[PDB]
Design a protein around this ligand. Sequence first.
Ligand SMILES: NC(=O)c1ccc[n+]([C@@H]2O[C@H](COP(=O)([O-])OP(=O)(O)OC[C@H]3O[C@@H](n4cnc5c(N)ncnc54)[C@H](OP(=O)(O)O)[C@@H]3O)[C@@H](O)[C@H]2O)c1
Ligand SMILES: NC(=O)c1ccc[n+]([C@@H]2O[C@H](COP(=O)([O-])OP(=O)(O)OC[C@H]3O[C@@H](n4cnc5c(N)ncnc54)[C@H](OP(=O)(O)O)[C@@H]3O)[C@@H](O)[C@H]2O)c1
Ligand SMILES: NC(=O)c1ccc[n+]([C@@H]2O[C@H](COP(=O)([O-])OP(=O)(O)OC[C@H]3O[C@@H](n4cnc5c(N)ncnc54)[C@H](OP(=O)(O)O)[C@@H]3O)[C@@H](O)[C@H]2O)c1
Ligand SMILES: NC(=O)c1ccc[n+]([C@@H]2O[C@H](COP(=O)([O-])OP(=O)(O)OC[C@H]3O[C@@H](n4cnc5c(N)ncnc54)[C@H](OP(=O)(O)O)[C@@H]3O)[C@@H](O)[C@H]2O)c1
Ligand SMILES: N[C@@H](CCO)C(=O)O
Ligand SMILES: N[C@@H](CCO)C(=O)O
Ligand SMILES: N[C@@H](CCO)C(=O)O
Ligand SMILES: N[C@@H](CCO)C(=O)O
Ligand code: NA
Ligand code: NA
Ligand code: NA
Ligand code: NA
Lengths: 331, 331, 331, 331
Amino acid sequence: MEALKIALLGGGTVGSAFYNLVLERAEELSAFGVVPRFLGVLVRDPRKPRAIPQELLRAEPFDLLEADLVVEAMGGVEAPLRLVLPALEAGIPLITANKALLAEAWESLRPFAEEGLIYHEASVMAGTPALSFLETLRGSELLELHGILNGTTLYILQEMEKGRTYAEALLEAQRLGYAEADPTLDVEGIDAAHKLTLLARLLVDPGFPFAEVEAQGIARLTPEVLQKAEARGERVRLVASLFGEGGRWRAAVAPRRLPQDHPLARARGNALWVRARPLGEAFVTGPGAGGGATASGLFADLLRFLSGAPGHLPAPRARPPLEEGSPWPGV
Amino acid sequence: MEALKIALLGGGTVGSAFYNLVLERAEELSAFGVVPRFLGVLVRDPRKPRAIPQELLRAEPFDLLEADLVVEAMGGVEAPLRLVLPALEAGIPLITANKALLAEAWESLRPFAEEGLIYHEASVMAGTPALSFLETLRGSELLELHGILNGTTLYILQEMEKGRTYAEALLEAQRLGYAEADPTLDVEGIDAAHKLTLLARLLVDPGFPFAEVEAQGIARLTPEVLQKAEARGERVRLVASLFGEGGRWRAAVAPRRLPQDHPLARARGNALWVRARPLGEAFVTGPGAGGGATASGLFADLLRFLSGAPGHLPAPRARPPLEEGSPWPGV
Amino acid sequence: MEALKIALLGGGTVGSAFYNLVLERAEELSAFGVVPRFLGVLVRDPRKPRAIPQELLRAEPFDLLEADLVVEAMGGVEAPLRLVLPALEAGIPLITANKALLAEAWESLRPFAEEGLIYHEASVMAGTPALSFLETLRGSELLELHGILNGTTLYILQEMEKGRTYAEALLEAQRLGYAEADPTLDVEGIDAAHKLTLLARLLVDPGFPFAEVEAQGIARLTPEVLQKAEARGERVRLVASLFGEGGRWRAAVAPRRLPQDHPLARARGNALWVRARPLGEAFVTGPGAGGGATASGLFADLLRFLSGAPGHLPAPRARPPLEEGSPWPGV
Amino acid sequence: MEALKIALLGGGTVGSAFYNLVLERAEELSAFGVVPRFLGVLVRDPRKPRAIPQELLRAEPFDLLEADLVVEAMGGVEAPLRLVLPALEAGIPLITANKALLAEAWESLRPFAEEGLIYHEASVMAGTPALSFLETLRGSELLELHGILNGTTLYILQEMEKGRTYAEALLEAQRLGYAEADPTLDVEGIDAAHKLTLLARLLVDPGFPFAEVEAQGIARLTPEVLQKAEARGERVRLVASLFGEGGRWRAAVAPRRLPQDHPLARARGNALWVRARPLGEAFVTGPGAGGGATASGLFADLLRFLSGAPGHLPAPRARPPLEEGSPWPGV
Ligand SMILES: NC(=O)c1ccc[n+]([C@@H]2O[C@H](COP(=O)([O-])OP(=O)(O)OC[C@H]3O[C@@H](n4cnc5c(N)ncnc54)[C@H](OP(=O)(O)O)[C@@H]3O)[C@@H](O)[C@H]2O)c1
Ligand SMILES: NC(=O)c1ccc[n+]([C@@H]2O[C@H](COP(=O)([O-])OP(=O)(O)OC[C@H]3O[C@@H](n4cnc5c(N)ncnc54)[C@H](OP(=O)(O)O)[C@@H]3O)[C@@H](O)[C@H]2O)c1
Ligand SMILES: NC(=O)c1ccc[n+]([C@@H]2O[C@H](COP(=O)([O-])OP(=O)(O)OC[C@H]3O[C@@H](n4cnc5c(N)ncnc54)[C@H](OP(=O)(O)O)[C@@H]3O)[C@@H](O)[C@H]2O)c1
Ligand SMILES: NC(=O)c1ccc[n+]([C@@H]2O[C@H](COP(=O)([O-])OP(=O)(O)OC[C@H]3O[C@@H](n4cnc5c(N)ncnc54)[C@H](OP(=O)(O)O)[C@@H]3O)[C@@H](O)[C@H]2O)c1
Ligand SMILES: N[C@@H](CCO)C(=O)O
Ligand SMILES: N[C@@H](CCO)C(=O)O
Ligand SMILES: N[C@@H](CCO)C(=O)O
Ligand SMILES: N[C@@H](CCO)C(=O)O
Ligand code: NA
Ligand code: NA
Ligand code: NA
Ligand code: NA
């Protein structure tokens, strides 16, 4: 039996859900050979109301080199990056739910991803299987991928069909915990773009640049637009697409008119839909955002690590596109 | 004496400071024959402890059309937009501290700015005079403008100079209520870009696009780079620059090497430095972020409105630059 | 018109109610000649959830000598005492809701009370008139005083008559905000004893020692006892008594069997009952605990000060008792 | 392997630390063939953020009679008493950290202590061995005991020595989770008196009354008095003393002038110093307050219980002292 010493960065909705999940499942962990011991949890206010014991909180950075694992769910890019890099350099794995970090600091983080040090299931659709889904889909070659990767904007659109306004639905969305710190990342497509980028690097091109994703959010959408779509037998959704065009992978986020019976249209939560050769059509759906949902993903990754498996490896080499996609109707 | 009917959007660091500042200055407001009456205060979470009366909190949007003023300090772009437009269309002024909104929704908001309906001193360098400073600088023709517009990154570079880390500094500035909710906006220069855009529009080109600002942040800087600059007799700062190049106005945000005696290098606070013809060289500096500092700007604008002055007008035409310029050397 | 600069010690349920009340009533204050300006609010956690703007919070002591008034509602004895004494020494008045402080540090605080520097209506039965009540009763000579001075133990007994247990009622009492930090002060009679002491010093003996109060709390009481009392046509209540015996003032707190039609028994909140010569029988009742209720008392004292009146003066000399009381049935 | 059924009373600084410590040590507990199962956790406010599952929180008292252990860390005396007695009467052990309860409700609790049903290591000097230390010291006859039992006042006097104020120090210790909820209990010596009582009862007289302890606090001490002691080669500390005087045991808490090389003066932490016949002079020191420190004591007691050992027994008789003693000189 061994101690698994964990440094947690962030003690918010996710961090705190992860902390309590780990301790609540310590019996499971013992069957994996370990007892979980948190070194410290990095936060900003160490004395406010929080669902972690106060003495574990650290309002300043602390040395991570004695940890066996670093778990990050602090948000942002350059601050977690600088905090994680010395741990990575020492061969200490990272488990993160932070898609911005991986999408926008990939020049620094790719080499550690490639040696299997980075686990990040929770960074796309929370603890819904997305990355593991794609890992199994690698048995085939992608033809087209379409996801509804952002839960905030899904919630908002669901509410506006029901005739609620953007602002009341976003407000409602932010109470329920779905949005990023700044909901602009959600409603402009950027958070979907970060997720889509990570999917692209896993499946089709390990160098895929976040800057190459074309992203348009839901700012032109209203209840009227959505309800008129319903009347044509369609649903409008924000969709993240990956497809070949002129021999290269293209990545877009935009609102799309979907047939109402399409798997993407009938999903109540977040969803990833592929067509691949020779498998065919496959689809995964589940909760894409929330504390418990994300902590599930991070805990799934801890068990993966404990099992002796590497983190989520980028594609070993870029894959040649088989077909010209370019499906589509925008809005 | 008559009610001044205010709808306030946001009850946070800024909104709350503003609410309480208004209350305690009620004596001052009576000298205009008004008494301040809040129609409601839009907030996300009506349960958090707040220095605003529970009975005035609204967790859903409320009718604005009876207000004499809408004050906005909620953050984001699309949601505040959709909330203020009806008031603006009714000829109700807006007082805002939200630079993202004005930079990114200008196609919708410019017509109302041109009519004098938008007050936004607090949208740049908080209640430090920036917009009013530029309004006076209009007596001359701009040669060049350079500002340290972002308080969060000034704070960070000041603390890194003294040997503190990036991560520590950042944690503090967030604590002090300086950082945008997405602090990436601060540290990648985007928030300074938004501010720069507004200054360009006030001075030189009323349709200057936010997309035309070139922005880069502080992500490559460390305590070491800064300390080496100090030994060369310099300071590295993030600088927002507006200058002529090949007959057009260029807007850039980037780290710059400044001579250490330069006003920008020494300033107490955020700072704006302008050479213009025939005035010469003028400078303003003060706090550029903080609840109190921002509530001062908003309240300044409310007093401006009560005086019968219009809001901040865009430049009444676009005009080319007088002189070819450049910023300081990059890093 | 003048600035009234206020230093607040404590930003809890009371402190925060007082802060918001002051600002909410600044129009009233202007009719008294002043505009209220808080120098700072002393707390412990300056970044947690609180109904006061964060920049006013001070997590460390600050200089009080520039204030026009010090307002204290921090709890305890020696820490507020040391904080207030330099202000008192400088002739700066104190307004307090802190009965422990005044009861247990009277050797230090009496001399300042005697020069009218201490206002403390809110320290007995919150903003229910108690001290001002006694000030008017000084027109007569006390024969007997009996109060139900502690709201926690009143609540608890009210709930146990209804058949609820001590522990559920105390729990219920502490949620509703009635109890001291440690409810032992309430349930053992000590908080009533502190209040009774202050009443004694106002009315009958300016040197009355807190140590001379005999106090017994409600620890032997159960629903059964209380319900049996109801059946004999009585109510049991914790009562604070002041009466002459052998030519001296005696002070006791204890549970008592009251006739059910007695003013003390039929009071739903806290209550002070006197017999005095030549007035006769007089009685005041109201809320004895709670934020809003206490802030009312502190604000009543601020207006008193602004009116040019002194604070609550002790009796100028001990008064000779006229009759042997010693009413009573204990339980 | 069998459930160890625990009812926990209190979910605060101590309770929460305890809850999470139990969870993470579940592996260790399996070595006794148990798995820990919480039947519920009594709390005041089920809405505060807490590192305990919502579904286990109870805001009203719950049946305890199915528990194998009641752990108490709620504070107060009468309410915990009325809650544990039924469990105690059923032959269910109590593990407590509450020294006030044991000192002040001993007429009710002594019979169950005498039966081995009360574990209270954490009630004195937290998880620093104090009770177990004394249990071993029973191999000798006590000559004299002197301890620095109160962590809050040690902390305060340590910080005042270094020039900090009373008020600052106090604010900190409260922040660190050291202080009783009424910190007056700490600074007037009452909390050390409660602890002293329990040590007297374990060692010399199983009915030693709390009322017989003479207690005075640190209220006359300042940075100046302490600094002057240091210049005389001394340290002033609050000391809890048990010593023989005229054939009876005397118990006193007071500030004392200690030689600076004395173990009590130097100790790292709270400290207990005992001369006994024939052992000689023994000493123990460690942290005497804190969530983690206390949860360690409680967990030590739970392991003691699982080992088949009884709780902490009172002295099996009263006996007079062997030698006339005295404490150090007062201040
Ligand atoms: N919630 C979701 O549904 C969800 C789903 C999937 C992925 N994620 C990802 O999880 C991350 C965090 O989200 P969350 O919902 O847990 O955020 P949250 O509730 O705000 O918590 C973020 C935590 O990080 C701390 N923190 C933030 N910036 C910091 C800095 N510069 N220095 C030190 N501490 C810092 C905060 O401290 P304080 O608490 O003191 O302020 C807090 O403890 C993000 O990357 C997000 O994209 C979230
Ligand atoms: N802080 C500064 O230094 C500073 C300086 C100048 C300008 N500004 C600008 O001031 C604006 C507000 O900043 P801040 O510091 O006050 O942020 P803050 O502390 O987060 O306050 C945001 C307020 O708006 C509410 N809110 C956020 N999104 C909402 C939505 N979709 N619907 C309804 N209510 C919403 C929040 O409700 P809850 O409290 O219920 O969460 C909160 O009351 C930003 O535009 C910022 O760029 C800030
Ligand atoms: N509530 C009532 O019904 C009531 C009625 C009449 C009289 N009172 C009296 O009012 C006083 C306070 O009561 P409350 O209900 O407002 O208490 P509360 O909600 O706990 O607030 C007490 C405040 O004082 C601060 N504080 C406490 N000790 C401190 C120290 N040593 N150093 C610095 N700051 C300290 C706290 O800081 P934090 O908030 O950071 O912890 C908090 O801001 C007591 O004397 C009480 O007897 C209360
Ligand atoms: N802190 C230490 O260093 C230390 C060391 C040794 C012993 N102790 C002892 O441990 C005990 C608890 O101290 P602590 O630091 O954990 O205090 P704390 O942080 O205030 O926790 C008290 C807990 O009990 C709950 N509570 C209080 N009174 C209650 C009532 N009448 N009914 C139901 N629930 C009640 C509170 O509920 P909420 O959270 O809902 O408010 C809280 O969960 C005290 O007896 C103290 O003397 C403390
Ligand atoms: N804010 C993000 C979290 C994970 O994608 C969302 O709404 O989906
Ligand atoms: N985050 C912004 C707010 C004020 O514009 C700043 O740091 O300057
Ligand atoms: N806890 C106190 C406040 C004022 O007496 C009470 O219950 O009455
Ligand atoms: N307030 C107590 C808790 C531990 O007994 C102390 O300071 O020692
Ligand atoms: Na996932
Ligand atoms: Na400004
Ligand atoms: Na009163
Ligand atoms: Na102990």
